[PDB]
Design a protein around this motif. Structure first.
Motif, PDB file in Angstrom:
ATOM      1  N   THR A 234       0.742  -1.129   0.014  1.00 37.13           N
ATOM      2  CA  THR A 234       0.159  -0.224   0.022  1.00 37.13           C
ATOM      3  C   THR A 234       0.681   1.276  -0.114  1.00 37.13           C
ATOM      4  O   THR A 234       0.673   2.255  -0.327  1.00 37.13           O
ATOM      5  N   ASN A 235       2.019   1.084   0.532  1.00 38.97           N
ATOM      6  CA  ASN A 235       2.998   2.246   0.614  1.00 38.97           C
ATOM      7  C   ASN A 235       2.959   3.115  -0.559  1.00 38.97           C
ATOM      8  O   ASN A 235       2.999   4.250  -0.856  1.00 38.97           O
ATOM      9  N   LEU A 236       3.025   2.317  -1.720  1.00 34.74           N
ATOM     10  CA  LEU A 236       2.950   2.926  -3.249  1.00 34.74           C
ATOM     11  C   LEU A 236       1.644   3.780  -3.224  1.00 34.74           C
ATOM     12  O   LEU A 236       1.608   5.008  -2.984  1.00 34.74           O
ATOM     13  N   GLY A 237       0.700   3.103  -4.213  1.00 31.27           N
ATOM     14  CA  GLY A 237      -0.483   3.890  -4.474  1.00 31.27           C
ATOM     15  C   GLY A 237      -0.883   3.388  -5.815  1.00 31.27           C
ATOM     16  O   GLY A 237      -1.315   4.278  -6.483  1.00 31.27           O
ATOM     17  N   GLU A 238      -1.119   2.381  -6.127  1.00 30.33           N
ATOM     18  CA  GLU A 238      -1.622   1.829  -7.366  1.00 30.33           C
ATOM     19  C   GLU A 238      -3.113   1.359  -7.192  1.00 30.33           C
ATOM     20  O   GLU A 238      -3.823   2.130  -7.305  1.00 30.33           O
ATOM     21  N   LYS A 239      -3.376   0.128  -6.999  1.00 26.98           N
ATOM     22  CA  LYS A 239      -4.818  -0.346  -6.802  1.00 26.98           C
ATOM     23  C   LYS A 239      -4.783  -1.792  -6.376  1.00 26.98           C
ATOM     24  O   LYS A 239      -5.516  -2.706  -7.022  1.00 26.98           O
ATOM     25  N   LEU A 240      -4.004  -2.088  -5.331  1.00 29.75           N
ATOM     26  CA  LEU A 240      -4.093  -3.555  -4.898  1.00 29.75           C
ATOM     27  C   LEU A 240      -4.600  -3.544  -3.796  1.00 29.75           C
ATOM     28  O   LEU A 240      -5.251  -2.471  -3.143  1.00 29.75           O
ATOM     29  N   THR A 241      -4.772  -4.663  -3.103  1.00 27.35           N
ATOM     30  CA  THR A 241      -5.520  -4.958  -1.813  1.00 27.35           C
ATOM     31  C   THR A 241      -5.202  -6.264  -0.932  1.00 27.35           C
ATOM     32  O   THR A 241      -4.261  -6.745  -1.350  1.00 27.35           O
ATOM     33  N   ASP A 242      -6.166  -6.747  -0.417  1.00 27.34           N
ATOM     34  CA  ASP A 242      -5.900  -8.071   0.060  1.00 27.34           C
ATOM     35  C   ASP A 242      -6.393  -9.038  -0.795  1.00 27.34           C
ATOM     36  O   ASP A 242      -5.626 -10.187  -0.861  1.00 27.34           O
ATOM     37  N   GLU A 243      -7.545  -8.807  -1.582  1.00 27.49           N
ATOM     38  CA  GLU A 243      -8.028  -9.969  -2.480  1.00 27.49           C
ATOM     39  C   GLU A 243      -7.070 -10.033  -3.740  1.00 27.49           C
ATOM     40  O   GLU A 243      -6.570 -11.270  -3.855  1.00 27.49           O
ATOM     41  N   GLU A 244      -6.616  -9.194  -4.276  1.00 25.78           N
ATOM     42  CA  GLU A 244      -5.628  -9.164  -5.346  1.00 25.78           C
ATOM     43  C   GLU A 244      -4.266  -9.826  -4.724  1.00 25.78           C
ATOM     44  O   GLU A 244      -3.920 -10.689  -5.401  1.00 25.78           O
ATOM     45  N   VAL A 245      -3.734  -9.242  -3.947  1.00 23.86           N
ATOM     46  CA  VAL A 245      -2.380 -10.051  -3.300  1.00 23.86           C
ATOM     47  C   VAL A 245      -2.674 -11.285  -3.226  1.00 23.86           C
ATOM     48  O   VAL A 245      -1.687 -12.277  -3.481  1.00 23.86           O
ATOM     49  N   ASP A 246      -3.926 -11.771  -2.806  1.00 27.42           N
ATOM     50  CA  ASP A 246      -4.065 -13.116  -2.375  1.00 27.42           C
ATOM     51  C   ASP A 246      -3.740 -13.975  -3.622  1.00 27.42           C
ATOM     52  O   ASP A 246      -3.154 -15.095  -3.590  1.00 27.42           O
ATOM     53  N   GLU A 247      -4.334 -13.622  -4.644  1.00 26.32           N
ATOM     54  CA  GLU A 247      -3.976 -14.098  -6.098  1.00 26.32           C
ATOM     55  C   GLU A 247      -2.598 -14.367  -6.401  1.00 26.32           C
ATOM     56  O   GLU A 247      -2.157 -15.299  -6.918  1.00 26.32           O
ATOM     57  N   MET A 248      -1.801 -13.172  -6.106  1.00 25.24           N
ATOM     58  CA  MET A 248      -0.418 -13.274  -6.202  1.00 25.24           C
ATOM     59  C   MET A 248       0.375 -14.097  -5.408  1.00 25.24           C
ATOM     60  O   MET A 248       1.205 -14.798  -5.804  1.00 25.24           O
ATOM     61  N   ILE A 249      -0.110 -14.355  -4.020  1.00 27.40           N
ATOM     62  CA  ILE A 249       0.562 -15.103  -3.128  1.00 27.40           C
ATOM     63  C   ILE A 249       0.251 -16.697  -3.582  1.00 27.40           C
ATOM     64  O   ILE A 249       1.192 -17.576  -3.185  1.00 27.40           O
ATOM     65  N   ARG A 250      -0.853 -16.797  -3.760  1.00 29.71           N
ATOM     66  CA  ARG A 250      -1.606 -17.985  -4.010  1.00 29.71           C
ATOM     67  C   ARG A 250      -0.799 -18.689  -5.225  1.00 29.71           C
ATOM     68  O   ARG A 250      -0.282 -19.734  -5.201  1.00 29.71           O
ATOM     69  N   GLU A 251      -1.013 -18.119  -6.243  1.00 28.27           N
ATOM     70  CA  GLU A 251      -0.390 -18.541  -7.442  1.00 28.27           C
ATOM     71  C   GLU A 251       1.137 -18.540  -7.378  1.00 28.27           C
ATOM     72  O   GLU A 251       1.828 -19.511  -7.720  1.00 28.27           O
ATOM     73  N   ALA A 252       1.775 -17.750  -6.312  1.00 33.60           N
ATOM     74  CA  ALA A 252       3.129 -18.024  -6.402  1.00 33.60           C
ATOM     75  C   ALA A 252       3.499 -19.152  -5.362  1.00 33.60           C
ATOM     76  O   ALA A 252       4.540 -19.778  -5.606  1.00 33.60           O
ATOM     77  N   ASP A 253       2.546 -19.347  -4.385  1.00 35.31           N
ATOM     78  CA  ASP A 253       2.939 -20.513  -3.370  1.00 35.31           C
ATOM     79  C   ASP A 253       2.477 -21.823  -4.075  1.00 35.31           C
ATOM     80  O   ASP A 253       1.709 -22.373  -3.929  1.00 35.31           O
ATOM     81  N   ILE A 254       3.266 -22.246  -5.199  1.00 30.12           N
ATOM     82  CA  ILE A 254       3.108 -23.469  -5.942  1.00 30.12           C
ATOM     83  C   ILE A 254       2.834 -24.675  -4.912  1.00 30.12           C
ATOM     84  O   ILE A 254       1.700 -25.096  -4.919  1.00 30.12           O
ATOM     85  N   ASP A 255       3.678 -24.809  -3.842  1.00 28.80           N
ATOM     86  CA  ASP A 255       3.293 -25.903  -2.709  1.00 28.80           C
ATOM     87  C   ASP A 255       1.813 -25.592  -2.080  1.00 28.80           C
ATOM     88  O   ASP A 255       1.194 -26.632  -2.163  1.00 28.80           O
ATOM     89  N   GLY A 256       1.663 -24.412  -1.693  1.00 28.97           N
ATOM     90  CA  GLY A 256       0.487 -24.019  -1.179  1.00 28.97           C
ATOM     91  C   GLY A 256       0.496 -24.296   0.399  1.00 28.97           C
ATOM     92  O   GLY A 256      -0.449 -24.677   0.984  1.00 28.97           O
ATOM     93  N   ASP A 257       1.574 -24.313   0.942  1.00 30.95           N
ATOM     94  CA  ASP A 257       1.563 -24.399   2.494  1.00 30.95           C
ATOM     95  C   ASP A 257       1.108 -23.170   3.285  1.00 30.95           C
ATOM     96  O   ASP A 257       0.468 -23.291   4.032  1.00 30.95           O
ATOM     97  N   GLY A 258       0.936 -22.102   2.481  1.00 29.15           N
ATOM     98  CA  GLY A 258      -0.048 -21.011   3.106  1.00 29.15           C
ATOM     99  C   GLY A 258       0.817 -19.562   2.803  1.00 29.15           C
ATOM    100  O   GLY A 258       0.240 -18.539   2.630  1.00 29.15           O
ATOM    101  N   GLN A 259       2.308 -19.610   2.841  1.00 25.90           N
ATOM    102  CA  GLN A 259       2.637 -18.400   2.810  1.00 25.90           C
ATOM    103  C   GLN A 259       3.917 -18.632   1.561  1.00 25.90           C
ATOM    104  O   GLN A 259       4.202 -19.784   1.144  1.00 25.90           O
ATOM    105  N   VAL A 260       4.579 -17.399   1.243  1.00 31.98           N
ATOM    106  CA  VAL A 260       5.578 -17.813   0.231  1.00 31.98           C
ATOM    107  C   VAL A 260       7.111 -17.790   0.744  1.00 31.98           C
ATOM    108  O   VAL A 260       7.364 -17.147   1.557  1.00 31.98           O
ATOM    109  N   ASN A 261       7.834 -18.950   0.373  1.00 30.17           N
ATOM    110  CA  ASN A 261       9.219 -19.288   0.932  1.00 30.17           C
ATOM    111  C   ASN A 261      10.268 -18.646   0.134  1.00 30.17           C
ATOM    112  O   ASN A 261       9.881 -17.820  -0.653  1.00 30.17           O
ATOM    113  N   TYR A 262      11.294 -18.902   0.348  1.00 30.14           N
ATOM    114  CA  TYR A 262      12.598 -18.512  -0.399  1.00 30.14           C
ATOM    115  C   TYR A 262      12.628 -19.172  -1.761  1.00 30.14           C
ATOM    116  O   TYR A 262      13.030 -18.647  -2.910  1.00 30.14           O
TER     117      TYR A 262
END
Ligand SMILES: [Ca+2]
Ligand SMILES: [Ca+2]
Ligand SMILES: [Ca+2]
Ligand SMILES: [Ca+2]
Lengths: 148, 26
Positions: free
Chosen positions: A110-138
């Motif tokens: 949010t520090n920026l000021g584009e147009k993201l939120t919780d729902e959108e990020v969700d799709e970013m972390i979910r798709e990024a978390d291939i495994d699906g443990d819950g969060q994004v690892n290294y």
């Protein structure tokens, strides 16, 4: 024989449109101080100029398009220094370090000021978390943005 | 089209600029 594409100029071009919150489209001391200051810092002035020469190949006080790619392209040999990417990692994680959370990133997103939120990020972390443990690892991070 | 790229890259521009400082002893 495919460098004639546009996906490249489009990628770097997007970085500016997001960074240059003004319009010029160049990383300068006023553009750096602003954004950099928004993160939580406030260096002196003379210190900035030093941060410009140490990277301003030409000398226009501000780096534009050719200068940008030249700084990311002109790679002086190699030092095996992964501290850069690393820092960017510790940055995303404002609290614990080792995984990215929705709330945690949300604030850093949010520090920026584009147009993201919780729902959108969700799709970013979910798709990024291939495994699906819950969060994004290294791994998923160094495996998705790996240097092709 | 939708990735952490333009995001990570951006911060990289401001982070590298900072790292350009010194980061060295003798
Ligand atoms: Ca600017
Ligand atoms: Ca210049
Ligand atoms: Ca963290
Ligand atoms: Ca995972």
């Amino acid at each position: 024989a495919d460098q004639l594409t546009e996906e490249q100029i489009a990628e770097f071009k997007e970085a500016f449109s997001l960074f240059d919150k003004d319009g010029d489209g160049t990383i300068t001391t006023k553009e750096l101080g602003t954004v950099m200051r928004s993160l939580g810092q406030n260096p002196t002035e003379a210190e900035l100029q030093d941060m410009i020469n140490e990277v301003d190949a030409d000398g226009n006080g501000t780096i534009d398009f050719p200068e940008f790619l030249t700084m990311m392209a002109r790679k002086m040999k190699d030092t095996d220094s992964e501290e850069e990417i690393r820092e960017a990692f510790r940055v995303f994680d404002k609290d614990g370090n080792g995984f990215i959370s929705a709330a945690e990133l949300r604030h850093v997103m949010t520090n920026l000021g584009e147009k993201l939120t919780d729902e959108e990020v969700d799709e970013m972390i979910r798709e990024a978390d291939i495994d699906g443990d819950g969060q994004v690892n290294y791994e998923e991070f160094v495996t998705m943005m790996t240097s092709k | 089209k939708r990735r952490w790229k333009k995001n990570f890259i951006a911060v990289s521009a401001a982070n590298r600029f900072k790292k350009i400082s010194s980061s060295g002893a003798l």
